[PDB]
């Protein structure tokens, strides 16, 4: 059979949400993708032997809350919390994203993965250990990725799927 998973990618402007999503759906890097485009994208893959249909919402635009947007954020089953390893502000923003997800899902038990993107870049400002400690306090996996080289990209999305599977067993 197959299973479908609704995945949502969140994080500050410019951390690489669109680049990560396009790497997964199209298997290549983009230098430039309209930062205002918020949309969902479908991709069939195979995860641990099971046909998996991923429906990936790539968030964008500006901060604002509507019934429309709360509803389609709430339909997400799991969330990638993306920061860039060379941008401390994006790391400091993760708390905001996690608390907004908890609000819209009305739950403290939401599948999430912390993603430190742009790992190919030399100018790191967020120590891997700091991100690991945060993920440990959240109870979630942490994966470092590069949308440019594709390092860790499949691992981030597939790990989120596995976190969803565990949640659905409850
Ligand atoms: C450069 C443009 C870009 O990529 N973004 C990212 C999305 N933006 C944004 N900024 C601050 N907070 C945001 C949010 F809180 C949400 C959000 C969450 C996380 C959960 C539930 C929501 N319901 N409505 C909005 C919700 C989103 Cl989707 C985006 C946020 C700025 C521009
Ligand atoms: N070197 C490098 N650049 C990246 C990476 N991911 C995204 N970018 C670049 O960072 C910028 C912002 O990426 P984008 O996907 O638009 O971020 P978004 O605002 O979160 O959707 C783009 O110029 C991308 O080419 C990465 O992993 N490594
Ligand atoms: Mg984008």
UniProtKB/Swiss-Prot annotation:
Query: Which compartment or compartments is the protein found in?
Result: Cell membrane; Endomembrane system; Cytoplasm, Cytosol
Indicate which residues form the motif Effector region. 33-41
Q: Which residues carry this modification: N-acetylthreonine?
A: 3
Query: Which parts of the sequence bind GTP?
Result: 11-19, 30-36, 60-61, 117-120
Outcome reported for the amino acid change (mutating residue 62 to H): In lung carcinoma
- Identify the main location: membrane
**Entries under SUPFAM superfamilies matching the protein:** P-loop containing nucleoside triphosphate hydrolases
Would you tell me the Gene Ontology cellular component terms?
A: cytoplasm; cytoplasmic side of plasma membrane; cytosol; endoplasmic reticulum membrane; focal adhesion; Golgi membrane; membrane; mitochondrial outer membrane
Substituting residue 60 to T results in: In GASC; also found in bladder cancer; somatic mutation
Its Enzyme Commission number? 3.6.5.2
Residues annotated as glycosylated are 36
Q: Where is the signal peptide, in residue numbers? A: none
**NCBIfam families tied to this protein:** small_GTP (TIGR00231)
What disease is this chain connected with? Answer: Leukemia, acute myelogenous: A subtype of acute leukemia, a cancer of the white blood cells. AML is a malignant disease of bone marrow characterized by maturational arrest of hematopoietic precursors at an early stage of development. Clonal expansion of myeloid blasts occurs in bone marrow, blood, and other tissue. Myelogenous leukemias develop from changes in cells that normally produce neutrophils, basophils, eosinophils and monocytes.
The record describes the protein's role as:
Ras proteins bind GDP/GTP and possess intrinsic GTPase activity. Plays an important role in the regulation of cell proliferation. Plays a role in promoting oncogenic events by inducing transcriptional silencing of tumor suppressor genes (TSGs) in colorectal cancer (CRC) cells in a ZNF304-dependent manner.
The UniProt subunit note reads as follows: Interacts with PHLPP. Interacts (active GTP-bound form preferentially) with RGS14. Interacts (when farnesylated) with PDE6D; this promotes dissociation from the cell membrane. Interacts with SOS1. Interacts (when farnesylated) with GPR31. Interacts with RAP1GDS1. Interacts (active GTP-bound form) with both SHOC2 and PP1c (all isoforms) to form a tertiary complex; SHOC2 and PP1c preferably bind M-Ras/MRAS, but they also bind K-Ras/KRAS, N-Ras/NRAS and H-Ras/HRAS. Interacts (GTP-bound form) with MAPKAP1/SIN1; inhibiting K-Ras/KRAS activity.
Q: What is this protein called?
A: GTPase KRas
């Amino acid at each position: 059979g197959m299973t479908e998973y609704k995945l949502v990618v969140v994080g500050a402007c410019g951390v690489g949400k669109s680049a990560l999503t396009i790497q997964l759906i199209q298997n290549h890097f983009v230098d430039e993708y309209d930062p205002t485009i918020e949309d969902s994208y479908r991709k069939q893959v195979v995860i641990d032997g099971e046909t998996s249909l991923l429906d990936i919402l790539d968030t964008a635009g500006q901060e604002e809350y509507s019934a429309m947007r709360d509803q389609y954020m709430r339909t997400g089953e799991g969330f990638l919390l993306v920061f860039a390893i060379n941008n401390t502000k994006s790391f400091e923003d993760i708390h905001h994203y996690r608390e907004q997800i908890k609000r819209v899902k009305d739950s403290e038990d939401v599948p999430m993965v912390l993603v430190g993107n742009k790992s190919d870049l030399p100018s790191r400002t967020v120590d891997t250990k700091q991100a690991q400690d945060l993920a440990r306090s959240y109870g979630i996996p942490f994966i470092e990725t590069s949308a440019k080289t594709r390092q860790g990209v499949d691992d981030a999305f597939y790990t989120l799927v596995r976190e969803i599977r565990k949640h659905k067993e409850k």
